[PDB]
């Protein structure tokens, strides 16, 4: 009925390059005449534990950076660091640059990842930002600098640049302005992700999806306030809803004629009483990685 | 390192998608060199769709009845022919974005990436498997007809699927790029059922190996089984036979994890007989069968 679908990756494939400093190598993003990549590339192995990035960078010049589009070198003509990203100005404007923007997403929002190795795209999949600001991605060694994105009409919104894998196997990274999602830093030390929670807004979208498809046994004749719902949800390790979350459920609410706070009351009964041997959309688990926009993308 | 359904990057296929229109009937086509491939269903009017005689319908068309649009550019059609359920429209301009490619017919259990398109415009990409009953469990809406499935090796696109229709059960049926259906289906708007489906055993075993590689091992045991005794239980539960070639293909994953293939079989046997008891594997409550051994090797190594 529903599966993770990625955006077509072509517009992003044409922007992927490789960046190397010494033997340190990773992926970068070539837009107009700038290449963006994790500043970790300037680290030697001995720097990686506890880098002084200001110190490392002032010892670099343009001629120390090898940027390659496949095997074609792009000459670097300027360099700077913005938070945890390196910005290399190159002498060639990428002719495959799409219309684009840089956005910072919230937990629960989904995006497509183009996993790349040595500047070469390998695979594309959808994933969600967890409430603890990690992603349950699929990434091997060499994936650093792979990007996440959404496409809205002809415009690519880049939201994620991959930096590191955490001890538990989840992934951490930054926006394209180099600000980390979550309390992580770009050093090769063990950092733990905070306890994760269930993405309530996406579970509600999934219940709407089930209603659209005629599976609606869980609808009740009760309602709740948002505040009371939020207080109860927290006791089952569910995220509180924001005003923005209520608003993004508006289209599904309209399509089904089920008020958001009535769906909240339905979810509240499921939390308190369980599924009691029943399934929703053929599954005993509530899915939390499909957004309201994903549901309308796939149903309509 | 993680485990997700992962598609091939779609860009090489995106640059080949076009819109084809015949009268008011419209769908997607695939532009390679100077030929556009699309479902022959596009030659049908509404009334034709229910019970078409395609040789008759085609003889009654000429080149100028076909409108091919690549974005807003119209490609002039200078020839037409039909190969089984695929129409081939020769156009007067070569597609410069044509990748290295081949046409391949896949076997049940093999996986591929789908590029879902609408009105010639790519919409989404995801991974599917050819089911044992020759359906696919896709994600397709009205207007997806002509979307293609493919695999990429190095720089060469192997096209294996052209989407035609959705069955009443909500699964999907289509052809290879020589226009032959997968399965007992026909390109007519009439209700069609598939054969009873079965589970792709070698793929379930591949996925259990992925689970072990990613640290989820609760289901392992030390029952031992023979291939033959595993196959008897598999058959009983509507699972496809596991062959010695399948065992061979799982060898690299067995070596990596230290778990013999027949020991993984013993684990699967117990899962079938006992269930998962509300536990999950790689976050799934069900035994996943749409990852091949090659898929697992590629994503885990
Ligand atoms: C040809 C042979 C290597 C050429 C020489 N060399 C070695 C290197 C090692 C590196 N390190 C990492 C690469 C990498 O892909 N991933 C991601 C990933 N995600 C799933 N996994 C398993 N790993 C990753 O976590 N790291 C660690 C890491 C990255 C960060 F940015 C950071 F702030 C903190 C860190 F601890 C990097 Cl960035 C470059 C390299 N060059
Ligand atoms: C633009 C404004 C005027 C549009 C005028 N118009 C109407 C049309 C209807 C059509 N039909 C279908 C389109 C379609 O996308 N899918 C796929 C899909 N997959 C998930 N779903 C739900 N449907 C699909 O099953 N069909 C049915 C079908 C297709 C076959 F090839 C076939 F042999 C037998 C069939 F019954 C077609 Cl092909 C062209 C059309 N043009």
Swiss-Prot record, chain B:
There is a cross-link at residues 5, 90 (Glycyl lysine isopeptide (Lys-Gly) (interchain with G-Cter in ubiquitin)). Changing residue 145 to A: Complete loss of 3C-like proteinase nsp5 cleavage. The active site is at 41 (for 3cl-pro activity), 145 (nucleophile). Changing residue 142 to A: Does not affect ability to cleave and inactivate human TRMT1. Residues 1-301 are cytoplasmic. It comes from the Viruses. It catalyses: TSAVLQ-|-SGFRK-NH2 and SGVTFQ-|-GKFKK the two peptides corresponding to the two self-cleavage sites of the SARS 3C-like proteinase are the two most reactive peptide substrates. The enzyme exhibits a strong preference for substrates containing Gln at P1 position and Leu at P2 position. Inhibited by pyridone-containing alpha-ketoamides compounds 13a and 13b. In turn, alpha-ketoamide 13b (tert-butyl (1-((S)-1-(((S)-4-(benzylamino)-3,4-dioxo-1-((S)-2-oxopyrrolidin-3-yl)butan-2-yl)amino)-3-cyclopropyl-1-oxopropan-2-yl)-2-oxo-1,2-dihydropyridin-3-yl)carbamate) inhibits SARS-CoV-2 replication in human lung cells. Inhibited ex vivo by michael acceptor inhibitor N3. Inhibited ex vivo by compound 11a and 11b. Residues 1-301 form the Peptidase C30 domain. It is found in: Host cytoplasm; Host Golgi apparatus; Host nucleus. 3CL-PRO exists as monomer and homodimer. Only the homodimer shows catalytic activity. Interacts with host FBXO22; this interaction promotes the proteasomal degradation of nsp5. Cleaves the C-terminus of replicase polyprotein at 11 sites. Recognizes substrates containing the core sequence [ILMVF]-Q-|-[SGACN]. Cleaves and inactivates human TRMT1, preventing tRNA guanine(26)-dimethylation of tRNAs. May cleave human NLRP1 in lung epithelial cells, thereby activating the NLRP1 inflammasome pathway. May cleave human GSDMD, triggering alternative GSDME-mediated epithelial cell death upon activation of the NLRP1 inflammasome, which may enhance the release interleukins 1B, 6, 16 and 18. Also able to bind an ADP-ribose-1''-phosphate (ADRP). This is 3C-like proteinase nsp5. It comes from Severe acute respiratory syndrome coronavirus 2 (2019-nCoV). The chain holds residues 3264 to 3564 of 7096 of the full protein.
């Amino acid at each position: 009925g529903f599966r993770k679908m990625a955006f077509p990756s072509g517009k992003v494939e044409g922007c992927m390059v490789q960046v190397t400093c010494g033997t340190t190598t990773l992926n970068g993003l070539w837009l107009d005449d700038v290449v963006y990549c994790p500043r970790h590339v300037i680290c030697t192995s001995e720097d990686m534990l506890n880098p002084n990035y200001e110190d490392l960078l002032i010892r670099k010049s343009n001629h120390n950076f090898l940027v390659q589009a496949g095997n074609v070198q792009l000459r670097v003509i300027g360099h700077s660091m913005q938070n945890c990203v390196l910005k290399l100005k190159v002498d060639t404007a990428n002719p495959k640059t799409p219309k684009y923007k840089f956005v910072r997403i919230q937990p629960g929002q989904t995006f497509s990842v183009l996993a790349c190795y040595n500047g070469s795209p390998s695979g594309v999949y959808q994933c969600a930002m967890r409430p603890n600001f990690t992603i349950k991605g699929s990434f091997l060694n060499g994936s650093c600098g792979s990007v996440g994105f959404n496409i809205d009409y002809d415009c690519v919104s880049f939201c994620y640049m991959h930096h590191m894998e955490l001890p538990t196997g989840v992934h951490a990274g930054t926006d394209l302005e180099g600000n980390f999602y979550g309390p992580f830093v770009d050093r090769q030390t063990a950092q733990a992700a905070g306890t994760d929670t269930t993405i309530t807004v996406n579970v509600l979208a999934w219940l709407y999806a089930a209603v659209i498809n005629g599976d609606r046994w869980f609808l009740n004749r009760f309602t709740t306030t948002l505040n009371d719902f939020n207080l109860v949800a927290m006791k089952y390790n569910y995220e509180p809803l924001t005003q923005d979350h209520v608003d993004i459920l508006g289209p599904l609410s309209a399509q089904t004629g089920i008020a958001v706070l009535d769906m909240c009351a339905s979810l509240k009964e499921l939390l308190q009483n369980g599924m009691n041997g029943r399934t929703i959309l053929g599954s005993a688990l509530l899915e939390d990685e499909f957004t309201p926009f994903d549901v309308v993308r796939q149903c309509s």
